[PDB]
Design a protein around this ligand. Structure first.
Ligand SMILES: Nc1nc2c(ncn2[C@@H]2O[C@H](COP(=O)(O)OP(=O)(O)OP(=O)(O)O)[C@@H](O)[C@H]2O)c(=O)[nH]1
Ligand SMILES: [Mg+2]
Lengths: 135, 270
């Protein structure tokens, strides 16, 4: 516990799944995708990798940017939230594999084209099981 | 059967989209209409909230939506389930970031030729039957709570975007050649309306005209959106170009006018 909020949001912005422990300013993540995906100054698609950036002022100040995963086929992004350079590497282990669970369980659903609705409601159970294994 | 959602980031563009889809999915009391699990053929996905958390859209998303108009009903609400007996249309949310606005406008500017088909899984430059992507309406969504701020950057940059948006459609009218002109009615929607600072629609209409018109003057010194000769720019001038411009309020979240007024505008226009 006590490492803030985890979010699972689509390329187009909708948040499929959210877990929030501390109140996190929306703009934090909002600033994050703005630079990583829209302006793109210092990022390369990968798993468990670099997760660093500073946005400049096309869209605001930005902090420096958690650790994150991208699934191009499904267009979902996985953000686990640091506390400004506090940490414990488990989230890395957490965030990439945790896409592997989420993808596994709901990968089929992104195929349906008409809607932004992926119902992943039972997920939280799995999530807890995972959180403990890293303690 | 397409209506374009347009506006700057934070407008609640992507979130309004979410609101309309989950409408039929939960009864009043925000109940999941489908938690009687294990109905293979028909069961609608369970939804936990009438609108979901969102962050800034990095891509257009086109979403499936049906408008009910039971007779005398006008467009019925977006929260009534249907199972058909409905006009069907595509609501396409779009990115608001200034970098991502441009592609959308290219669509606005070329009339029929482009049409309005987005190559999903990305931007350009899984269920198949005779479907179309006609463009009959465009919605411009703004934050009427942020508009209140004295920083006044929002109205200026927001009105500027609207200026292009309205301007492109104007160029679209001059593109009737591609002999088959279509009138594009535009809804200017003042969102974030449960917030106390939310600027009233009438004011948003009035401010925009003032901001837009000045921009033309600002740009003219540097085409002339609206009338060839305008003492001042009104939305009413845009009619000349077959553009029904309407300022209407609403809120995606919280207590307020609701989104139905918008929704009623949309159904009347497909
Ligand atoms: N209180 C309140 N919040 C709203 C309203 N409409 C939208 N929001 C919130 O505004 C936040 C940002 O809006 P989004 O829809 O996610 O962003 P966007 O409008 O798609 O704009 P982009 O950044 O270009 O993608 C969301 O968290 C919404 O919950 C509203 O009417 N009232
Ligand atoms: Mg969005």
């Amino acid at each position: 516990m006590s490492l803030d909020a985890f979010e699972i949001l689509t390329t187009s912005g909708v948040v499929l799944w959210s877990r929030t422990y501390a109140p996190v300013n929306p703009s934090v993540v909002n600033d994050f995708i703005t630079d990583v995906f829209i302006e793109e100054k210092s990022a390369v698609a990968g798993s468990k990798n670099g997760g660093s950036a500073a946005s400049n002022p096309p869209y605001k100040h930005d902090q420096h940017s958690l650790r994150w995963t991208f699934v191009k086929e499904l267009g979902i992004i996985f953000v686990a939230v640091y506390r400004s350079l506090l940490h414990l590497p488990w989230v890395d282990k957490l965030v990439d594999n945790i896409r592997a669970i989420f993808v596994s369980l709901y990968s089929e659903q992104f195929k349906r084209p008409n809607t932004t609705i992926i119902e992943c409601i039972n997920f939280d159970k799995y999530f807890d099981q995972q959180l403990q294994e890293l303690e | 059967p397409s209506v374009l959602l347009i506006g700057p980031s934070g407008a609640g563009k992507t979130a309004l989209l979410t609101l309309f889809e989950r409408g039929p999915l939960l009864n009043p009391d925000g109940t999941s209409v489908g938690a009687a699990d294990l109905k293979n053929p028909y069961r609608k996905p369970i939804v936990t909230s009438p609108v979901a958390q969102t962050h800034t859209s990095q891509v257009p998303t086109s979403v499936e939506l049906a408008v009910g108009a039971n007779e005398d009903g006008t467009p019925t609400s977006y929260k009534v389930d249907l199972d058909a007996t409905a006009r069907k249309f595509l609501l396409i949310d779009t990115p608001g970031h200034p970098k991502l606005r441009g592609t959308t406008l290219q669509h606005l500017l070329n009339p029929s030729p482009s049409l309005t088909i987005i190559p999903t899984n990305a931007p350009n430059k899984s269920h198949s039957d005779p479907y179309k992507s006609k463009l009959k309406a465009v919605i411009f969504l703004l934050d009427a709570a942020a508009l209140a701020d004295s920083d006044g950057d929002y109205l200026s940059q927001t009105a500027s975007y609207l200026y292009d948006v309205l301007l492109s459609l104007q160029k679209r009218f001059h593109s009737r050649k591609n002999r088959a002109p279509s009138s594009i009615p535009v809804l200017i929607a003042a969102n974030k309306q449960d917030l106390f600072t939310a600027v009233p629609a009438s004011l948003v209409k009035s401010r925009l005209e003032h901001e837009l018109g000045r921009i033309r003057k600002t740009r003219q010194k540097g085409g002339w959106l609206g009338a060839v000769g305008s003492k001042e720019f009104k939305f009413e001038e845009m009619m000349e170009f077959d553009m029904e411009v309407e300022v209407m309020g609403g809120n995606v979240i919280g207590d307020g006018p609701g989104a139905e007024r918008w929704w009623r505008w949309i159904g009347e226009r497909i």
